[PDB]
Amino acid sequence: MVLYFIGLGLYDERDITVKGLEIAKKCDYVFAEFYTSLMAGTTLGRIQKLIGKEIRVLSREDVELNFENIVLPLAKENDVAFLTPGDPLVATTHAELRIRAKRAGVESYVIHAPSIYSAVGITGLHIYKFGKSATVAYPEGNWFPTSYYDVIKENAERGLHTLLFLDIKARKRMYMTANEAMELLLKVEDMKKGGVFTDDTLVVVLARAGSLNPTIRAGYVKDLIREDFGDPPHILIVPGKLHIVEAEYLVEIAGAPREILRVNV
Amino acid sequence: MVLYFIGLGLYDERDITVKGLEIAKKCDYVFAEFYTSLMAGTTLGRIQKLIGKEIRVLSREDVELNFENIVLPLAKENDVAFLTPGDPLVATTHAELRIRAKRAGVESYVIHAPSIYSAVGITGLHIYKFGKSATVAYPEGNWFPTSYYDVIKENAERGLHTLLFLDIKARKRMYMTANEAMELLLKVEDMKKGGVFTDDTLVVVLARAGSLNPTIRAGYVKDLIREDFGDPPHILIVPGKLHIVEAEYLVEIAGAPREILRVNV
Numbered sequence: 001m002v003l004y005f006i007g008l009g010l011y012d013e014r015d016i017t018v019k020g021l022e023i024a025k026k027c028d029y030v031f032a033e034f035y036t037s038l039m040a041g042t043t044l045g046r047i048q049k050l051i052g053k054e055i056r057v058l059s060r061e062d063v064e065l066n067f068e069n070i071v072l073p074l075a076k077e078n079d080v081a082f083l084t085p086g087d088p089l090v091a092t093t094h095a096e097l098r099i100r101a102k103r104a105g106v107e108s109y110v111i112h113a114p115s116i117y118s119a120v121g122i123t124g125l126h127i128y129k130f131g132k133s134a135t136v137a138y139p140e141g142n143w144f145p146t147s148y149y150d151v152i153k154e155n156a157e158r159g160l161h162t163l164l165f166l167d168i169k170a171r172k173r174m175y176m177t178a179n180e181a182m183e184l185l186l187k188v189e190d191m192k193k194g195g196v197f198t199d200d201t202l203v204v205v206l207a208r209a210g211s212l213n214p215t216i217r218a219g220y221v222k223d224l225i226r227e228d229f230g231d232p233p234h235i236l237i238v239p240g241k242l243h244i245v246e247a248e249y250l251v252e253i254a255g256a257p258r259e260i261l262r263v264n265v
Numbered sequence: 266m267v268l269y270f271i272g273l274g275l276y277d278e279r280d281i282t283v284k285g286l287e288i289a290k291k292c293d294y295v296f297a298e299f300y301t302s303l304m305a306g307t308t309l310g311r312i313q314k315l316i317g318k319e320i321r322v323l324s325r326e327d328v329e330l331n332f333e334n335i336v337l338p339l340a341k342e343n344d345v346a347f348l349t350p351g352d353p354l355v356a357t358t359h360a361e362l363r364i365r366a367k368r369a370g371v372e373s374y375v376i377h378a379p380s381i382y383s384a385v386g387i388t389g390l391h392i393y394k395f396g397k398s399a400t401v402a403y404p405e406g407n408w409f410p411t412s413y414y415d416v417i418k419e420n421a422e423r424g425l426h427t428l429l430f431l432d433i434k435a436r437k438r439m440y441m442t443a444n445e446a447m448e449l450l451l452k453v454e455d456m457k458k459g460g461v462f463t464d465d466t467l468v469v470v471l472a473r474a475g476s477l478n479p480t481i482r483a484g485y486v487k488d489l490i491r492e493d494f495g496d497p498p499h500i501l502i503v504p505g506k507l508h509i510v511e512a513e514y515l516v517e518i519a520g521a522p523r524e525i526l527r528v529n530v
């Protein structure tokens with residue numbers, strides 16, 4: 001009789017909320033997509049085992065083109081659930097799917113889950129200081145994306161931190177690393193020469209957030225660009241002017257250079 | 266030797282993640298703070314019942330002043346859990362507590378949970394378009410804070426949305442409503458005349474995020490200022506220019522006026 005959008009969280013099958021699980025367990029049909037983000041600490045099997053249902057995985061095309069033909073038809077006579085990594089409506093276009101549900105006469109409900117958007121709090125950077133966000137897109141062909149560069153500039157100019165989602169090619173199983181993101185930005189700087197991103201720029205890397213032992217490292221681009229941050233997914237953050245307490249955390253927890261402790265008020 | 270920062274999520278005792286609940290159960294001691302925010306849809310008893318552990322509630326002073334003397338000692342020879350509403354470390358003062366753990370020779374891990382910071386994605390507004398965040402605080406005595414007004418101005422100026430956390434009197438359990446927030450903003454406008462928040466401003470109200478029946482409403486201040494959005498907690502959003510898809514969601518899902526499709530896009 002209804003459609004539930006249930007988030008699965010950051011890293012493993014246990015990042016789903018209790019609410020999400022109890023509801024998923026009772027649904028008649030369970031669908032899911034795993035292309036918007038990467039859950040590096042679980043497997044389909046482990047999720048199916050936890051939920052106790054067979055999970056039909058949909059591709060980007062299945063959702064974007066046939067969500068109303070594959071999922072919605074069943075939601076009219078049964079309790080159906082649509083699973084996604086992290087939070088279902090964050091950094092995705094899944095919100096529009098609720099409009100499709102409505103027009104098909106299907107009531108929908110949303111069950112949230114931990115999101116990278118807020119998990120960045122673990123980096124010690126004040127969440128309220130994050131500005132506009134952006135995604136570092138893999139260049140393809142003769143098209144070289146640069147919008148994410150402008151976002152960093154605008155935020156930094158206002159003293160705001162910039163969260164950078166990193167590209168992903170689910171089918172090709174290619175997950176952009178922080179290292180690759182840094183390389184691309186240095187290239188954009190050479191083009192625009194805005195002083196936005198250089199070897200001296202302080203940056204923060206968060207890898208496999210959600211895991212019990214995430215990789216959190218802060219430092220200058222010149223020293224981190226070739227560092228190994230472990231398996232994906234990775235997120236890159238270009239901080240704005242730091243509060244002393246932020247700097248203290250980056251140094252004590254993310255092993256940043258003790259010189260950042262001396263902020264230039 | 267291990268301290269666990271566990272997020273309780275958005276609204277009720279089921280908003281904790283499966284990972285958080287299980288870890289909390291295996292802990293010898295369980296502490297909790299309910300001053301950075303509250304869990305409006307549940308009670309301490311229901312949370313205790315779910316965890317199956319006695320939960321010692323700590324005040325603000327307990328944490329900020331005596332965290333190392335109340336929680337860390339037991340964490341040296343036991344598994345201790347520290348529960349907080351939402352996602353740990355989103356509240357600005359939490360991060361520092363991890364540094365205290367380190368200096369006490371105690372390991373700490375963070376178990377995430379849904380945060381309102383990310384749950385706002387249910388409003389249909391693109392998460393990447395949210396800029397700096399702010400808190401609307403109740404004026405008191407001869408003190409009238411207005412910095413949240415400037416945040417809205419700078420974000421909107423760059424086409425970004427502004428998330429406004431609303432004040433809360435933790436002990437008294439008094440929640441500032443979106444209505445009160447709107448009234449305060451109109452008063453600040455009358456004083457600053459910046460043309461940032463008026464009867465014609467479009468706003469979005471999200472009430473009881475996390476609940477299965479949250480209230481999602483969007484409209485002009487003149488029409489929503491005295492509307493009843495239901496029980497707390499309420500969150501207010503002043504969106505910037507809208508992408509057509511955001512507007513269609515606000516209209517179809519949040520009951521916004523068709524007018525927004527031409528005036529705010």
Ligand SMILES: Nc1ncnc2c1ncn2[C@@H]1O[C@H](CSCC[C@H](N)C(=O)O)[C@@H](O)[C@H]1O
Pocket residue numbers: 010011036037038085086087088089090091092114115116117164165166167168206207208209210211233234235
């Ligand atoms: N656990 C994690 N650690 C680091 N980055 C992560 C992450 N989970 C997601 N991301 C980042 O976000 C991108 C997917 S964007 C989709 C995000 C999702 N709805 C959420 O709420 O988290 C990834 O390519 C990656 O850069």
